[model samples]
Target chain A: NLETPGARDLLLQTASNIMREGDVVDISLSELSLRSGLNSALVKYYFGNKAGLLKALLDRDMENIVKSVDALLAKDDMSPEAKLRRHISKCIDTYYDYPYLNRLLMRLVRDSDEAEAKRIADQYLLPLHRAYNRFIGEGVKAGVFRPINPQLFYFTVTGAADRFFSARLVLKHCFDQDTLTEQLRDSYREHTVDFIMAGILAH
Target chain B: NLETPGARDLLLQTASNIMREGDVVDISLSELSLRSGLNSALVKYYFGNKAGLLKALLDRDMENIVKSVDALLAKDDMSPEAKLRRHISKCIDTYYDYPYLNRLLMRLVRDSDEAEAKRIADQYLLPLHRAYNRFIGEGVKAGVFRPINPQLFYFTVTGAADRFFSARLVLKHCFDQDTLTEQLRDSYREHTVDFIMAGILAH
Candidate 1:
């Protein structure tokens, strides 16, 4: 029967694990079927198609992320420096957990219809920009941080996290790193947070 | 005949421009044929195949880059700050010009045979790391820079530049920018340089 949420959520979990393990944004239908033992045809029944499946995955990941960041901004007692440090550290962790997040988002944004693209931009992307604007504005006014372009900061922070985590082969060949370990992610998190903090802190 | 270098260079140039304008790593052979007005089969004649064409382009862009950085380090008179400022600025400009450069390298590194992957790492990736080690070492000794990981620095700088430039749709939909203008590139360059310098400069 098509009644239970079990099959639907199972499909999403399998898809996410596939992308993470393979370190690629795409999943193979055959591999997905083999691993999950779910009929590939159920993808049609549940998500309607492969693209729809990807969309469901993106929605699942982005919404989870968006909610946390929104909550981070609501904690008024936190100092800006502390807020940013926690935020940046969590970002590295997020990318470590979901290295394909931005790549998948970019692919969907480009390939989807204009209305859908606008929906993603409006829903997920704009809130981020607004959050940066407020946080950076608060910091600057509080004399704890220097004035910097929030738009550019968005790119800088996201780029650093995405680029480092998405680089699985770069790590393997250049650094002899066989996997993205928790140790490596923690080290990068501290380094990135320190570097960015120094960049923005008022002298 | 493949004797003359004109057609070969034309194919390389056209492919690079296609990636730049499309703001995507992969290219379309039909578009390549239509734009260059060369037979799609010539891709086979000159480069042996499409993947080969990609390798040629990667080699072309990277060697030009690797040489310049080598020359930058060879300049004995440049102060560490001056050298880094120039190097960072040039990196931003390079990505602006060849947005697909790193993405393409990444693709080849992942999809290619292991021997070829090792070659790319040894040839291109390692040298950059070595350069950073020397430059950062020099700066730390001179007290202009705090000690930092050169390997991570590679990802930071490259990720910053690569992600920003490669993000054509993010810019279009989120910021309403229709194109990557010279002005935008210059602004981001200055911001990135200032931010990174603040991050690394000794207090």
Candidate 2:
């Protein structure tokens, strides 16, 4: 899988670029080959098509996101509150690190490939939700966090946080002129954590 | 000149239909005319071409959203809570009314022309945000609303609301097909209203 470095890098880099600033609805092998300096046949050879390529990149990102996740989240060294915060911070970081995580994931779910979409939902997203539910329950049972709907909590907090970062184009246009600024990221960092913590603070 | 209703309706209807399911990247006149049974010549004549037609449809949508002024939302008799709830309801309803709202606005912001993007922000989007900021500030000043960042509040609340309504593909995956469930809508209406009210309840 990691044998051909040139084609692999080209495909992944092209995929990343497409997800970052382009509408990823109709990604074609010809477009990838032309841009990545690879052959169209090579793309087909590598991914079998967009479905295979999309699935590969998504799987990589999901693994990159959640590897060693629960081990640390379940570490007894940190309090439940601290663990929850760490989890959220990591979630935001993962989305930001890959910039196109949510967008491409949603696109794939609506993709022509049905089995792959269901696999993503069942394998990554649902388990991720379940993992966080345990985190929320830990805090709630310890009487340190307010009782809340774990499902709603998952959607709302991640929705807000991801939107804060996922919306690079909109955020840039609306208020702040430069969305790529370090100051903007830091501001949203504390702003998001503060906002959500306030909502979930009471025991 | 209200010359012909059938062609115009069909063209716009087809355009709207396309955007609802796909990104508005480069809609072809030939395709639109072909799909709607209107000729390319008539398409050009009606809207001066693709750009003109897009502008016309977007303007029509904005006008539709901002129509019917001086209604219950502006009435003096309504409490701040009532007004806020009404506003949220309208916001959700608006998203449903135009499922392509966020996607198209984001596209317009990043459209090929810089002036069109800036014009959208200055003329329409920014004014809408300012109007809502005043609404929030009014509630805050009257001691009827909790202290909060109006800007972050706008992004967070709208982010949550839109995701709740907008993720048509994901929702069907989550529960046993809750995309348009009456039960889902009622629950989300109360769920969102309650969850938000709890967070900003004079804290």
Candidate 3:
């Protein structure tokens, strides 16, 4: 069933697509009204303003992401390390699959104040931190990984994966290859995992 | 004296700030023109168009970057391995110093078509690639590193460093850090170099 149950759904969907494709700073009510054929006043009336629209957009996506990640964590047969790897890989896969999401999120965090940005971070990223701590603790206990700062280890691993998707332009240019192609991405997945494991694994 | 002169410089600086804080797709000429108190025609007149403006901004920065890198590479006392590590550290430091450059370059490559992006890459990135290849080749020949694909080695090292800055938002949120403070950054520098050496050291 449609959630909004009215023309509001159409407006929000159109506005979301625009925000997804463009910069958050540039998303004006006038532009949204023009593109969506909704009254200009309707944007203010329904969403309050541009910031409200952005918050709403982020909230919708964050809710979906939380649900998806929760489902991933709920899997029963996975080892903690495997689960963590799966989570990292899924995050990478999602960024690749939904490039606009990464772009939009990047803009929001960069442009917003610390408070607003942290709110978004708490919503979408705290799970990642908790998962990594558990995974690293388990790996250390299993005698598989060296004892190191779990936070640093987590940053290095995720930073490697995240950069691949976010900097495809630089990668493609620097490497003279299309980085997002299935083969290249698969190589990256292997290389990143291997590189991180090499650092953390006990000899 | 500023070489590019008044209104042009103003427009470029303002646009650069916006792009640094937002995404490429959201950079609007009308808004930029209005914000700068210049006619929209002046933007097209000076920069030819939006893409042209981006190219100009990037080209200027890349020129400066190449000059600095070349100066660093020309130092006589550093061993090739040390030189390579220094270069990587310098590059990482540069991103920290000029945070927007990474984001601007990322947006340029990701949003453009393959051919167009490749053209930009050729202009901006090929020199670094060549330098890295030479460094890695020399290291392997000197028995300092294992004989691995130089390109892959280069990608792993640089990719890890590049991702660290661009993903600071997610990193800070997940790690509960305010920023990658200088102390933490120095720690990262050591870890990243050590990680690479561990993976590739012949000893």
Candidate 4:
């Protein structure tokens, strides 16, 4: 399976939630199988083993996210600000599709062997940042974006975009709503986009 | 002793770092002793046991943070924006002194008995949110801040302030810099404050 979509992907979705709950140490074949409602042996048969399962999942997710950045950045005719609006939308949208994107990537960075973590950074993380830097720099040069450090910009915008997804404890306690409604998610996404865009737009 | 400070505080400090790596299921006394360079039984002597050690740590930390917030919010003469600026500053500053504050609190919320967790939210978190809401409301009424939903304001400002602290993994890989220099944090604090204020301040 080269591509996996959320609606029918029990194994993938279960694994994503597990990633948020803990890390590689927290995952086990039995737990994964139980959560997915698949037999442990059958799940192993599908992916070979735990590492194999994680590898397959990461491969798919990285490819999915990277492809978006690559495609949008490759568009020669798109204005930088327009490209960024779309790119930020894709960045925020990743969480809806894979709710554990931040936690999983963070854990992956810490859980892997040094060489392996570096490979992820170089292969997936760096390329995305580089692409972001180029567009943001061009936008600033065109006077459509404020002069901001692209490194800081990445985390700041990502922070605004993704916090609501990871911030379950804060949200649930404050609002007595443990999970976000689709309407709230849409509203949060718009607020984030507008608020961050306001800061980035030339003063 | 009703009070303990740095001299006998190695265990608590070390445990905070440990929480970032693991959770309730992961900590071992021997491992903690090894990392802290103190005798294993010495730790038990100080705090009674593993669970008690964690209980004591959380007690002190929660009390410490709660006091700071209560003291700051008690200042009736401070401008609303000034009060909020400090509030947000304290919120972000949690990660510096207690780098695993979010992770530790998150695990505690999940691991604790329901009543215990409710006590925490009611005793500390809700009060802080209430203080914030009053100040924000006052600011909006005075026409100093833009009209905004208090609940959304809580999340947005907290997200902007706190997400960078948690997004440490993302930062190191992109910049290849593992340490958040005091200078970098200062700069980040300014950027966060200014950017967030830009969105909330009457334009």
* iRMS values for every prediction: 3.3, 3.8, 5.6, 4.7
Candidate 2 regions with alpha-carbon error over 4 angstroms = A1-10, A23-42, A64-73, A124-127, A137-152, A161-163, A170-177, B4-14, B21-46, B60-75, B123-127, B140-148, B170-179
Best by TM-score: 1
Fraction of real interface contacts that model 3 preserves: 0.21
Tens-place lDDT per residue, model 3, A1-203, is: 43445666667667765644442224667878888887877767667877677767656554544453565447488765565566556655654544345445555665567887766655543345565566667678888767666555544554444445545634544456565678988877776655555666666
Q: Tens digit of lDDT per residue, candidate 4, span B56-173?
A: 6666665645554565557578876776677667656764555444444555555566777666645543346666576667788899887766555544555554456655634464
lDDT values, one for every candidate: 0.75, 0.63, 0.60, 0.63
After superposing candidate 3, which stretches have Cα over 4 Å from the reference?
A1-84, A100-102, A110-116, A147-163, A166-181, B1-57, B63-80, B109-117, B125-127, B138-181, B195-203
Native interface contacts kept by each candidate, as a fraction: 0.49, 0.28, 0.21, 0.23
Candidate 1 runs further than 4 Å off: A169-179, B28-30, B169-176
Instruction: Kindly indicate the candidate among 3 and 4 with the higher lDDT.
Output: 4
Better of 1 and 3 by DockQ: 1
TM-score per candidate, chains pooled: 0.90, 0.79, 0.63, 0.77
lDDT value, residue A173 of candidate 2: 46
Supply candidate 4's per-residue lDDT for A58: 66
The DockQ-based CAPRI class assigned to model 2 is: acceptable
lDDT of 2 by residue, A48-90 (tens): 8777888778777667447534644565788766766666676
Q: What is the lDDT of residue A51 in candidate 1?
A: 86
Better of 2 and 4 by DockQ: 2
Clashes counted in candidate 2 amount to 0
